[PDB]
């Protein structure tokens, strides 16, 4: 049967970028042509593979990662990028093989008084490894004195809200992102294209 990309692309609610979702896709026939013509996308970029070539390729597993970021941050979802999102929320390797798909979701993820359900990590001691997920909410120690889980001076809550409002500019509007990774191991493949 077909691979269930619709459960990722057409989900009614998306995850925060710091707690990004990942769907492992296995033991199915992937139909990329219908997937890539399923909707209109504001960003469509592939690395190490052509979009039209996936119909001929077989992979051990395919990963579909999904999250919401703001418009001016979609450029960070790419190999070799730095910034708050790539350093502290969602990181792609330098030799990333896959595709990055994004579309404006202002009509879905903004609210009248500000949508405060989508957050990103603002403070972190060190950069994430590629494909790492950090869901810690520990108070960030910005100075010498320890925080003991209490907010205050030099003691910051690590997450920040986007506060999406539909009247914002496009750079500040929410964008849903789907990243397709293609894990090629020395094992029998389970996901081939048609």
């Amino acid at each position: 049967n077909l691979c269930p990309f619709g459960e990722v692309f057409n989900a009614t609610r998306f995850a925060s970028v710091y707690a990004w979702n990942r769907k492992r896709i296995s033991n199915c026939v992937a139909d990329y042509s219908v997937l890539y013509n399923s909707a209109s996308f504001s960003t469509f970029k592939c690395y190490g593979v052509s979009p039209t070539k996936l119909n001929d390729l077989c992979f051990t597993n395919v990963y579909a990662d999904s999250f919401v970021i703001r418009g001016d941050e979609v450029r960070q979802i790419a190999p070799g990028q730095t910034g708050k999102i790539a350093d502290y929320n969602y990181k792609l390797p330098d030799d990333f093989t896959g595709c990055v798909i994004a579309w404006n979701s202002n009509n879905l993820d903004s609210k009248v008084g500000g949508n405060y359900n989508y957050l990103y990590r603002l403070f972190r001691k060190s950069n994430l490894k590629p494909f790492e997920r950090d869901i810690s909410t520990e108070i960030y120690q910005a100075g010498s004195t320890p925080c003991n889980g209490v907010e205050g001076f030099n003691c910051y809550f690590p997450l920040q809200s986007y506060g999406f409002q539909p009247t914002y500019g496009v750079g500040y509007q929410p964008y849903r992102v789907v990243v397709l990774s293609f894990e090629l191991l020395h094992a029998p493949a389970t996901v081939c294209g048609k």
Partner: antibody
Amino acid sequence: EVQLVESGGGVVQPGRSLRLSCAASAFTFSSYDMHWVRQAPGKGLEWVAVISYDGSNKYYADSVKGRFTISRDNSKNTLYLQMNSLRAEDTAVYYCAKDGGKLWVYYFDYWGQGTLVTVSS
Amino acid sequence: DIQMTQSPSSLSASVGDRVTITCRASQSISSYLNWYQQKPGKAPKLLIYAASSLQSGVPSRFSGSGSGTDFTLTISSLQPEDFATYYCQQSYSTLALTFGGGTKVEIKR
């Protein structure tokens, strides 16, 4: 012995349209991706668009997106480039290119001879 | 957008000389670097694909090497008909293919 023969270039006023063609021969046309690459006079090469083997997926460079359209008629072994709202910057020699099928990524193994498009009034 | 930088922009070598052209990438492109030759008034021609693979029919005096950010095209023994402009082109970002500025090779005589 792979041939790509283009045609359809000429003079076009700014804002008007023009349609280029490129006929393929001596290879399995309906199973290869096809590209368009242009070159302004005295400048370098610029990738324009790509269409899948069956014509269902189309991708464009930001410089021509929503303004140009690529298509193919596999029963005629011909590739097309529909150019609307032509600006002065669109003046270039346009090439069609076959995608070599030995990699996971795009590359142009066979090119057409090119046809000149001059946007002028 | 990955910017490709070619050096030198122009060079002059005589027949039989060894010619090496350098192409640098603003970021790692693995091995997806292709080389093209374009004669004056002619369509480009594929010489090397995937950093070092020789395209069928290309003469043996052409070769390539490199990885990551530094790549090279080498003409072992320059011939008179080798006068052209040589472009490098990265294919790692498949939906934003970019070319280098090109290197014009001129024949010393």
